[PDB]
Amino acid sequence: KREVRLMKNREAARECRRKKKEYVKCLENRVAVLENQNKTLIEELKALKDLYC
Amino acid sequence: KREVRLMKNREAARECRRKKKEYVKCLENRVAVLENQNKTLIEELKALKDLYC
Amino acid sequence: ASNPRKFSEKIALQKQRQAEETAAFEEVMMDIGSTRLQAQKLR
Amino acid sequence: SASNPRKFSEKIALQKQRQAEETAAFEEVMMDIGSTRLQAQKLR
DNA sequence: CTTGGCTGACGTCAGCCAAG
């Protein structure tokens, strides 16, 4: 019973660390994308002010 | 040295995990901020769209 | 819901929100020229 | 590995730095937005 | 009211790499 419980959790721990790794990489990727969109919207809004001023 | 090495390593492991936890919360926080910033810039750009036809 | 427990649910939420913004972001940028032409119409 | 450090402390400090920059510029474009809406009155 | 499935947190081993 012990050997079974250990093997199941040991195998279920690897998939847990994998999902966390992917989740962190997801946040980093989403930060980079939102950063670029932020820079573009700022640059254009600043240009849209110049367009009418 | 092993009894000292293990103690130093397991103590430098807690702080390592603590910094990662702080780093993830940092990413999640930064994501939320970039979310509100981008959404604000989008609406403001749409405001100048309606205002200037 | 807003703060899931499973990592799979967290990833799904982040990709959902990212898709919505990108869809909205690529709409604002899509027809900027239409607004840029309005100025030439006003000047 | 310059923009992508190894130490988490360096990573956190980097994200803090960028967040400060992004917010600083954002608090500028949205600040004097009122002066732009006043220029609109001249047209109509 | 239990359970099984995930996750948080732990300690240990192994490897990278600036600092010696």
Next chain:
DNA sequence: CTTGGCTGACGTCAGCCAAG
């Protein structure tokens, strides 16, 4: 050439909680 400081990845223990 070492070493010490950090981190990746492993397995194990304990606890939370929607699913029963």
